[PDB]
Amino acid sequence: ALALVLVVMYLFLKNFKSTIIPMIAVPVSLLGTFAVLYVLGFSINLLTLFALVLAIGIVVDDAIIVVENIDRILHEDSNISVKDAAIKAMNEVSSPVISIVLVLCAVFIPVSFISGFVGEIQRQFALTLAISVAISGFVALTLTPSLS
Amino acid sequence: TGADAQTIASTVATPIEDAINGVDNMIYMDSTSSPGQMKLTVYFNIGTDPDQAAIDVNNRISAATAKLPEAVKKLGVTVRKSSSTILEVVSVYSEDSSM
Amino acid sequence: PDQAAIDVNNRISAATAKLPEAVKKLGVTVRKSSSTILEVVSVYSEDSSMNDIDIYNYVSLNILDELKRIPGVGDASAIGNKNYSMRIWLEPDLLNKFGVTANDVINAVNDQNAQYATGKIGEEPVVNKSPQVISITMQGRLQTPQEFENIILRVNEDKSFLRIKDVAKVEIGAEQYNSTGRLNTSAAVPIIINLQSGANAVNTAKLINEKMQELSKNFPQGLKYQIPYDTTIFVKASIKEVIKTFVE
Amino acid sequence: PDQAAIDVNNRISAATAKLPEAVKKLGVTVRKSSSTILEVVSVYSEDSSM
Amino acid sequence: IGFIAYLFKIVPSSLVPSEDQGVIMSIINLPSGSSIHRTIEEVDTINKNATQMKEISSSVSLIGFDLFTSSLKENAAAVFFILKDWSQREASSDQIIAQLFGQYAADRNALSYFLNLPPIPGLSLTGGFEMYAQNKSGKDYDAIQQDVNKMLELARTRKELANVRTTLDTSFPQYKLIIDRDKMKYYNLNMQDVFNTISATIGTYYVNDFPMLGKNFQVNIRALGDFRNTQDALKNIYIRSSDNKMIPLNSFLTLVRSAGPDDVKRFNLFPAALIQGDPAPGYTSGQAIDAIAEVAKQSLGDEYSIAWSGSAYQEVSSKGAGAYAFVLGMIFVFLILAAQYERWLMPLAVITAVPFAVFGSILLVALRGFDNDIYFQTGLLLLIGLSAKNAILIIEFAMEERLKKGKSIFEAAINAAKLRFRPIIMTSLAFTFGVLPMIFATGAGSASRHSLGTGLIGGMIAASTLAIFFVPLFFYLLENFNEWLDK
Amino acid sequence: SATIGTYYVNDFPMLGKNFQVNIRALGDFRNTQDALKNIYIRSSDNKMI
Numbered sequence A: 001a002l003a004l005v006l007v008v009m010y011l012f013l014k015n016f017k018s019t020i021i022p023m024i025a026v027p028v029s030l031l032g033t034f035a036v037l038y039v040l041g042f043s044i045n046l047l048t049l050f051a052l053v054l055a056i057g058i059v060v061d062d063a064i065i066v067v068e069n070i071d072r073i074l075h076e077d078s079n080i081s082v083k084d085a086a087i088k089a090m091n092e093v094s095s096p097v098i099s100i101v102l103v104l105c106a107v108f109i110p111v112s113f114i115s116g117f118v119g120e121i122q123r124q125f126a127l128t129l130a131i132s133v134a135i136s137g138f139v140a141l142t143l144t145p146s147l148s
Numbered sequence B: 001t002g003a004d005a006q007t008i009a010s011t012v013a014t015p016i017e018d019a020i021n022g023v024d025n026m027i028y029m030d031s032t033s034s035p036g037q038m039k040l041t042v043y044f045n046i047g048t049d050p051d052q053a054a055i056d057v058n059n060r061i062s063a064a065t066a067k068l069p070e071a072v073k074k075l076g077v078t079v080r081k082s083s084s085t086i087l088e089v090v091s092v093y094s095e096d097s098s099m
Numbered sequence C: 001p002d003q004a005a006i007d008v009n010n011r012i013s014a015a016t017a018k019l020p021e022a023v024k025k026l027g028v029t030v031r032k033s034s035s036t037i038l039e040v041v042s043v044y045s046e047d048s049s050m051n052d053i054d055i056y057n058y059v060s061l062n063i064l065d066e067l068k069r070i071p072g073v074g075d076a077s078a079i080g081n082k083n084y085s086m087r088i089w090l091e092p093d094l095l096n097k098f099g100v101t102a103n104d105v106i107n108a109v110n111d112q113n114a115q116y117a118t119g120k121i122g123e124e125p126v127v128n129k130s131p132q133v134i135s136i137t138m139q140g141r142l143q144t145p146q147e148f149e150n151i152i153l154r155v156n157e158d159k160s161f162l163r164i165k166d167v168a169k170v171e172i173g174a175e176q177y178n179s180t181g182r183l184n185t186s187a188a189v190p191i192i193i194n195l196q197s198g199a200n201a202v203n204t205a206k207l208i209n210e211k212m213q214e215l216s217k218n219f220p221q222g223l224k225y226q227i228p229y230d231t232t233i234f235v236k237a238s239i240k241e242v243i244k245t246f247v248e
Numbered sequence D: 001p002d003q004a005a006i007d008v009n010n011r012i013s014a015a016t017a018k019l020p021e022a023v024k025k026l027g028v029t030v031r032k033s034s035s036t037i038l039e040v041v042s043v044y045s046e047d048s049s050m
Numbered sequence E: 001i002g003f004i005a006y007l008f009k010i011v012p013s014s015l016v017p018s019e020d021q022g023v024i025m026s027i028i029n030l031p032s033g034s035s036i037h038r039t040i041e042e043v044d045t046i047n048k049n050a051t052q053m054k055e056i057s058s059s060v061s062l063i064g065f066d067l068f069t070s071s072l073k074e075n076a077a078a079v080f081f082i083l084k085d086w087s088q089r090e091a092s093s094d095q096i097i098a099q100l101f102g103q104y105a106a107d108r109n110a111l112s113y114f115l116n117l118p119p120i121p122g123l124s125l126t127g128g129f130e131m132y133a134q135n136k137s138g139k140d141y142d143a144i145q146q147d148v149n150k151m152l153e154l155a156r157t158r159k160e161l162a163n164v165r166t167t168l169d170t171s172f173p174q175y176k177l178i179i180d181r182d183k184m185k186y187y188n189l190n191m192q193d194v195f196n197t198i199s200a201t202i203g204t205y206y207v208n209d210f211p212m213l214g215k216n217f218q219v220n221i222r223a224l225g226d227f228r229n230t231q232d233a234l235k236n237i238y239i240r241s242s243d244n245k246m247i248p249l250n251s252f253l254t255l256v257r258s259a260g261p262d263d264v265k266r267f268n269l270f271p272a273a274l275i276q277g278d279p280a281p282g283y284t285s286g287q288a289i290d291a292i293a294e295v296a297k298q299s300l301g302d303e304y305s306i307a308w309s310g311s312a313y314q315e316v317s318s319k320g321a322g323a324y325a326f327v328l329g330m331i332f333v334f335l336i337l338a339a340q341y342e343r344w345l346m347p348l349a350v351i352t353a354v355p356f357a358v359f360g361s362i363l364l365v366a367l368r369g370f371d372n373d374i375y376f377q378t379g380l381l382l383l384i385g386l387s388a389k390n391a392i393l394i395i396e397f398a399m400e401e402r403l404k405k406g407k408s409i410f411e412a413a414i415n416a417a418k419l420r421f422r423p424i425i426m427t428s429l430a431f432t433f434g435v436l437p438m439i440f441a442t443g444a445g446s447a448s449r450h451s452l453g454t455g456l457i458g459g460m461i462a463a464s465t466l467a468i469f470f471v472p473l474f475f476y477l478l479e480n481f482n483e484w485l486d487k
Numbered sequence F: 001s002a003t004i005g006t007y008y009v010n011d012f013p014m015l016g017k018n019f020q021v022n023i024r025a026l027g028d029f030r031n032t033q034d035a036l037k038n039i040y041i042r043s044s045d046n047k048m049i
């Protein structure tokens, strides 16, 4: 997935240096997820590992949305510099991203409240996803624009 | 040893089952008796700490050991947490007929 | 509340050996109970179709076990202690006539009302294999008073067997005749519930009420439960009074 | 130390069989212990009559 | 949306996909009472035939232990047939199971059931209820099972219940010892003593422990098996009288052929039988639980009672917690997007984007034939959220065009959608292709991989192919409605 | 303890549970101070005392 993202980053954004930003960001957004999963009682088991595959999605989307929108603004105006462009785009998307992380976690926590053996199974997946959205979203807010 | 399941259910299972009843956070109890052996698995509400469940069951049982038949007391009662699962099975085998 | 019980239990176990044998056979119980009555539930026969000994037994076997399981109940005990027992009522004038001591009755019942171990037939190691393994079963505990009556104290050499029937009267009575309970003016069995230490009275009280409603559906005709004395009633009532005050 | 005690008692209980009968009859005791001696008090009869 | 609900109804609802774990468990039970020698011979015949098949490399066996009813029964025995690595064997576990079933399909000495190891240990793949019919009247176990077999016949008539079965078996051979207490007493023999003699000769008596290799080991006394095997075993056993007279056991003791339960089960402090059942493919698990309860109350006597274990217990004791939580979660989502858009109506547009993802997922699984497993449900959580994220952005950018740049309601919905076209395409392309290997995955965990994958691919495709066209339409309608309110 | 008091010898099976057997004398014989005189024990030389 990481390499496929690089291919989309390279073809769509027509830059090779733009690929470095996902490379640094995606692992950081997964290592962070692991650290929280350690602090919480969660262990690595088959169901959490399946969740990690799902988690890749949230993390990749967050990097892609940020880089692309900065590039879009950097191509909309010749006069705009990369750093001004980053600030502009971040102002546009900062509020949605915070709202995305709250909305998404609201989607996942009720799954954790499901009672029964199937809710225990489902919660292992859901909570991991909720951790991922938050860690990924903080990275999208701070680390990703800076790298861009 | 040497007792039929009916005898072991009435003589051994019933005294033990009664003592453990009322142990905190216990949803239900199930006991099966087979000639020579009694297996009784308490089931506890989800989220109960195993170590706390085991120790409680043990307490209640050591009070009712005396009621139990002497042969059963001589061998004693084993209380264990069954929450564990099988990581792996290792079978040592005599390829030859020498053991 | 729970670690204290573990600590008390751990220390008592060494003492349990030192205790007298009879005490240890009946058992010693360590329970996390305040000994202060949360509530008293009265199960009574309105129909009067069930005698008090029977009502008590129904509430021990069917209701008490369920109430003990409910979270927050340290111990639920019905006051009467009239659980069934086979009672062998010795008559000392017949014992004296047939020359039998009480002890010879005690020894006889222990020996002739017990279930022992009998092994299986066809089990291995056997040189000549058999088609099946069959398990010997035995019944050595008498279930009826007429069977208990026929326990043999001595053979009178005319091959006449002296039995309990001759020296005593057997019946199914109750283990203790010491205490009874009443609801209003009529007889009822009183089930006193003591709250487990560290548990909410109101939650436990509401749980006991809902278990009893479920149990009542299965009650044999003529049985009503009332719970006249409940402690939480006042607490809940004062909660309602302060809620009304808040609106006002 | 309280939770350590529970885990020792639970493990001993599981191994009921391995133990010889005479130890079982007496019983096995698991209790939290500390070796620190805070103090040694010595009670003596000044009179020496006792 | 109507199609989504038709699809949800036609797709089977199964808890977790059956999976090849590499082991083909085999439970072999001989007729009741069979001696271990018969059972071992049968295991041997079963295992040399298995050796013939290439895929089954080795085989572990456990004679005399019944796997289903944990217990030591001589008639029962389980032979686990270890298969070859997934990458080394073309045949799947199911194919090999069929071959094993086919060879043993013929009637023979034993009955063999071949099954794949449980996908998730400690969990029944079925939605089956375990119900214990406790007997409060003291009836004997033989009487209990005649009462419960009647329950069974009523149960099999009812539609919701399927595969209703009971664990209790009274078939096992037993010998009943009749004690003539008149004679025993007359022979001056005490009852405990006459059983110590039986326990030593016919059965095993553990007198004391002896030291060996640093560990105390048991000392046991039993008779040469030549003596134990026959019913008249009793006649060679003798017990001293208090008058010092040898008196044979057969005099006062008689062994009578009988049949009785090998395993006696008591649940919740009451004698009980266990009724297991499966829901009807059409009917839900909850419906099955309700149905069997009704059957039990009418067929069984008032003296009986019904209790539940495992999954059934939880369903009966359910606080409807999940339902409350889900409603709260939605209300929270509503409000948190209301804050973002500063409009009460606008977050409805985001919630409408969600069923396009859900439709792609349930459509593809239906075409594939995959069921509504937990994996599918977890897939949905991701799908939903990804679809929501994309929608939140399209709607926000649209608001900006309408407000900041003063674009037209129609023009704004075109501009936003086009601005957000590229990020959605890029993320979908990367992720879908990334999880495409799951669809083709083989080896351990393959069924699970496939199940998570099929839902994901379908949903992702739907969200990028269909949702993006639709979300502007929703926004266009809501913005128009807001303007109408302003008028 | 078996004529003035109740002695729990063993358990008897009823209703799927085990219930105590208690051997105590008839009430009239334990009703007075001189109750002790009615009760008789055998000795080692088999004579009731």
Ligand SMILES: CC1(C)S[C@H]([C@H](NC(=O)[C@H](N)c2ccccc2)C(=O)O)N[C@H]1C(=O)O
Residues within 6 Å of the ligand: B086, B088, B089, E023, E025, E060, E067, E068, E080, E117, E118, E121
């Ligand atoms: C009784 C069991 C819990 S054990 C069996 C299975 N056991 C294994 O997979 C063992 N690891 C094994 C035993 C023998 C040979 C190979 C593996 C499991 O736990 O799911 N399935 C269950 C069953 O057969 O009901």
